[PDB]
Amino acid sequence: ESSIQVKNKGSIKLSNVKSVVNSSGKLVITSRNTELKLIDEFGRTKESYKVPYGAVLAKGDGEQVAGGETVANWDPHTMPVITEVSGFVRFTDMIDGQTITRQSSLVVLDSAERRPALKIVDAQGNDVAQYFLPGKAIVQLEDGVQISSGDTLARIPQDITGGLPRVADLFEARRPKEPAILAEISGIVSFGKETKGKRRLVITPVDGSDPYEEMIPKWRQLNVFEGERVERGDVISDGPEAPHDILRLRGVHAV
């Protein structure tokens, strides 16, 4: 996400990247599906260089570059998320012994011990834009900081063996160790069902149109976003992809 090297002159070609207000003279990224392309003289491209949503545009879109220079420097270990609103941080529902564990810089809240996402105070006493509080989060700026747009405060920071076994797994369609969780129903980020019959983070639907029930184990982590996470369809959220899911959602040509 930080080491980007170009071959020759090319363009940006964001390919439908959601542009958001950034702290510096650049545009923030909120979409998880980002792909670049280099245009030298015609429609032929040089490389893709997919980057996460924490990428920061170092140059302009469609601007010719001599080459040998990075175009987007982002945090390799930290995954920043663009701020929903610009203003003071609104923190509430904080109880000592349940939402404060380590120490200023302190954890916002613990879901197991209890996610305050009321609103964001754009002004001194006016709020709008919900500040999600993930597990084991870190908050270093208290209320009333009045930070600029695009600022991120610890937004949750941080088989396929080439050979005959890989081919054998591919041709008989062996399921991966960690199949990706896909839900083509009302793909808007939410929260709830911490403890139920299923594992942690049982379900994460939205209203949309005719929502259904999809159980989520959430073993490693989740792939929730602040605003406009995904849409009609499904993208790789966690782990590798299973061919059966591609057949049932993407169709046949993608498979």
Q: How many angstroms separate the CA atoms of 9 and 152, rounded? A: 32
- AA letter at 216: I
Contact between residue 205 and residue 211 where contact means Cβ atoms under 8 Å apart: yes
CA distances from 145 to 58, 89, 120, 142 (A): 27, 7, 12, 6
Task: Give Cα 34 distance to the centre of its chain.
Answer: 11
- 230 to each of 67, 83, 111, 190, 224, how far by Cα in Å? 33, 17, 24, 12, 9
Residue-by-residue DSSP string for the chain? ------SS------SSPPEEE-SSSSEEE--S-------SSSS---------TT--B-S-TT----SSS-SB---SS------SS-BB-------BTTTB-----B----TTT----S--BSSSS---------TT--B-S-TT--BPTT--S-SS-----TTHHHHHHHHTTPPPSSPPP---S--------SSSSSSSS------SSS--------SS-----SS----SS----SS---HHHHHHHT-SS--
Angle at 213 (CA atoms; ends 191, 182), nearest 5 degrees? 75
Question: Of 50, 41, 117, 40, nearest to 85 (Cα)?
Answer: 117
Q: How was this structure determined?
A: cryo-EM
Cα–Cα distances in Å, from 204 out to 50, 185, 222? 26, 10, 10
**Spatial distance between the Cα atoms of 92 and 208, rounded to a whole number of angstroms:** 29
Residues in the chain: 255
Which value in Å is the resolution of this experimental model?
Answer: 5.8
